[PDB]
Design a protein around this nucleic acid. Structure first.
Ligand SMILES: [Zn+2]
Ligand SMILES: [Zn+2]
Ligand SMILES: [Zn+2]
Ligand SMILES: [Zn+2]
Ligand SMILES: [Zn+2]
Ligand SMILES: [Zn+2]
Ligand SMILES: [Zn+2]
Lengths: 47, 67, 142, 295, 149
RNA sequence: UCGGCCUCCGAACGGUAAGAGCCUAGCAUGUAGAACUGGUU
């Protein structure tokens, strides 16, 4: 019943956008701009 | 100079010799390598990382910048 | 049971010697399945050599002390891993007839380059105390 | 950025007679950089051996520089000349030497003393031995003469304490009851034993040595005439005169075999006090031991 | 004896040692832990010696001499694979013939999946799974008893 | 009744501060040591 999935383990979210709502880089932010508290796949599979 | 490594290992008291089926030896090498990569990870106190079995390094949780 | 590496016909006197080794092999399986918790670090390897010693002694008892088995089946039992060739060759020497293990006379395994003290004869013990060998559990094999 | 403690690698360990054992033929093991020093924390050459038949496989604990500094054994941490704790010897001779306790200062001081010893002849316990010329004050009274082999006894089997030693007589550890855990003699910090600070064995031996008045005398009301008992007819007035000639001028020297007492009196109070202290259960002349008291 | 060489002890000794020290979690095997790290310095050599001695497709079971640490930290294959060159070339030519015949004759060749075991499936014990099962057949071109006598 | 020539190819750092100390993990050691009371003006 093993169902292991090789994930991509680099969640590229802007931490400044995630808990503030403002990023100093603006449109030149390397990571994506999203504010949500959903769990990741490895956090779900670990739980 | 020749300097045979395995004869130097067999000259000491920490090494022994036997005869073994090759599949058992390969399982022993894979288990030993996985066990000691976990030992290196636990030596560096990186309990939030995890080695797979198929040698896939993954974090358990989301990491801080120090981690 | 044991998977035979030769994959050929076993020799003629095999069928009356094959059950005993088989249950000896089952004893070896018990030595592979005992829990290591409780005894010591070095105690858990103590039966295995002894069981192997017993196996080798049985084939020795078929060939020299009784001469009741053929030469080629004795070579087959050597080649199938049922007996140790080096332990048998040490057993044919004069002073080494009830040798516990090949490891226990190895002079490269000790700190001072000596043998173990279960190779010391019991009349020359000179220290007292119940002696049990750390390599193999031997109590005076000389 | 290029200062660190050098690793002490040398042969020929400095041990007591008691920890070395009694056999003239000892089989000896040496590791080049096996363990660290228990005091100065440097790596050092570790020596391990069995002192006898049923002993403990004793091994060296402190490095050779610390043991050459305090003139002690590498295992027992007791003095080589007398077999005493270094707190007792420091109370006997000098307690103003001291050593730092913080690790950087301890490493710096140990490196400086190691460089001083390596710039010296090689085997000398600094000028402290120059302060150790005066001896036999009271330390020779309680010093052991026989090799106390009972500290080479093996450890107590902890499985037998819980009553689960399945080895039985095969177990090399001791199958006997331990000491009292409520006793304050059982604490025994190693750094406290090395530094000579609040060691309970040293306090117990100091209390034992303080209760033996081998140099008190002075039981007369300003009278220099003291009686030494135990002399008898074996010791005459010539031995008393030869003993009192080192103190200077003697007022009266006589021996009486009726009471077996030697009457000694000096014209000086300090010479009579020195003669009473030298003859207070520590003087043996002509096969007769003398104990000084009032007469 | 002037000197005795180091001989071979049974494989149940090393099998019991590898059966113990299970993922280095027990406190009884604490003192071996540092020794178990020292095999970063020598498992490239163990990989090389293991992978050069992999069995050929006409072999079912190949037994090798193994030099192993007493704590079970590492296990080198202590041999060099020596072959006679015309026998080796003829064996691989017979292999080539049966592979061409098998790809001509099999209706649906199926590749085995990769990886064969999952990332949380634990590695199988040799004695519990492989030591007591009969191996399958090798490739093994049958020869003419008259022509290839 | 007249020709063949065929580079590439992906990962890390570079961005989601730093310090701090309170209980907490993991990990090191398997230690050195237990000395006890006696003499006449
Ligand atoms: Zn952003
Ligand atoms: Zn033995
Ligand atoms: Zn032995
Ligand atoms: Zn023996
Ligand atoms: Zn000593
Ligand atoms: Zn030191
Ligand atoms: Zn015990």
């Amino acid at each position: 019943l093993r169902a292991t999935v090789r994930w991509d383990y680099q969640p590229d979210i802007c931490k400044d956008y995630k808990e503030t709502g403002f990023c100093g880089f603006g449109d030149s932010c390397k990571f994506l701009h999203d504010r949500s508290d959903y769990k990741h796949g490895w956090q779900i599979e670990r739980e | 100079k020749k300097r045979y490594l395995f004869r130097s290992f067999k000259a000491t008291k920490f090494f022994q010799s036997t005869k073994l089926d090759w599949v058992e030896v390969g399982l022993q090498v894979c288990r030993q390598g996985y066990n000691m990569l976990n030992l290196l990870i636990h030596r560096k106190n990186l309990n939030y990382l995890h080695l797979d079995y198929n040698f896939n390094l993954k974090p358990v949780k989301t990491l801080t910048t120090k981690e | 049971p044991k998977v035979k590496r030769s994959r050929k016909a076993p020799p003629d006197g095999w069928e009356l010697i094959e059950p005993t080794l088989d249950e000896l092999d089952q004893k070896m399986r018990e030595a592979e399945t005992e829990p290591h918790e409780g005894k010591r670090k070095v105690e858990s390897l103590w039966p295995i050599f002894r069981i192997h010693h017993q196996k080798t002694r049985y084939i020795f008892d078929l060939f020299y002390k009784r001469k009741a088995i053929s030469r080629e089946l004795y070579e087959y039992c050597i080649k199938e891993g049922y007996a140790d060739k080096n332990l048998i060759a040490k057993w044919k020497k004069q002073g080494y007839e009830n040798l516990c293990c090949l490891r226990c006379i190895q002079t490269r395994d000790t700190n001072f380059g000596t043998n173990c003290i279960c190779r010391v004869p019991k009349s020359k013990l000179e220290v007292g105390r119940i002696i049990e060998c750390t390599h193999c559990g031997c109590r005076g094999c000389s | 950025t290029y200062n660190r403690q050098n690793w002490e690698d040398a042969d020929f360990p400095i041990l007591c007679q008691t920890c070395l054992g009694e056999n003239p033929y000892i089989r000896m093991t040496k590791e080049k950089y096996g363990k660290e020093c228990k005091i100065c924390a440097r790596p050092f050459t570790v020596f391990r051996w069995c002192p006898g038949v049923r002993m403990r496989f004793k091994k060296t604990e402190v490095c050779q520089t610390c043991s050459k500094l305090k003139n002690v054994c590498q295992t027992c941490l007791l003095d080589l000349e007398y077999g005493l704790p270094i707190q007792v010897r420091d109370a006997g001779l000098s307690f103003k030497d001291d050593m730092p306790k913080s690790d950087v200062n301890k490493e710096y001081y140990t490196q400086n003393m190691e460089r001083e010893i390596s710039n010296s002849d090689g085997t000398r316990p600094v000028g402290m031995l120059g302060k150790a010329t005066s001896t036999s004050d009271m330390l020779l009274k309680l010093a052991r003469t026989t090799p106390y082999y009972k500290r080479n006894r093996p450890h107590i089997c902890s499985f037998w304490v819980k009553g689960e030693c399945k080895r039985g007589e095969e177990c090399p550890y001791r199958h006997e009851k331990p000491t009292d855990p409520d006793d304050p003699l059982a604490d025994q910090n190693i750094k406290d034993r090395y530094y000579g600070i609040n060691d309970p064995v040293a306090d117990k031996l100091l209390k034992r040595a303080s209760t033996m008045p081998r140099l008190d005398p002075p039981e007369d009301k300003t009278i220099t005439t003291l009686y030494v008992g135990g002399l008898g007819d074996t010791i005459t007035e010539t031995d008393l005169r030869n003993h009192f000639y080192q103190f200077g001028e003697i007022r009266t020297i006589t021996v009486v075999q009726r009471q077996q007492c030697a009457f000694i009196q000096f014209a000086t109070r300090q010479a009579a006090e020195v003669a009473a202290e030298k003859s207070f259960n520590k003087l043996i002349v002509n096969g007769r031991r003398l104990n000084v008291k009032w007469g | 004896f002037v000197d005795a060489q180091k001989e071979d002890m049974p494989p149940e000794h090393v099998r019991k040692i590898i059966r113990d020290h299970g993922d280095m979690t027990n406190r009884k095997f604490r003192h071996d832990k540092r020794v178990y790290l020292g095999a970063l310095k020598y498992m490239p050599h163990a990989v090389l010696k293991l992978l050069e001695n992999m069995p050929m497709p006409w072999e079912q079971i190949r037994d090798v001499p193994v030099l192993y640490h007493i704590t079970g930290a590492i296990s080198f294959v202590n041999e060099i694979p020596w072959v006679i060159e015309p026998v080796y070339i003829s064996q691989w030519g017979s292999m080539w013939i049966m592979m061409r015949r098998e790809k001509r004759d099999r209706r649906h060749f199926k590749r085995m999946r990769f990886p064969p075991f999952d990332d949380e499936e634990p590695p199988l014990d040799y004695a519990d799974n492989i030591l007591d099962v009969e191996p399958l057949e090798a490739i093994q071109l049958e020869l003419d008893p008259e022509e290839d006598a």
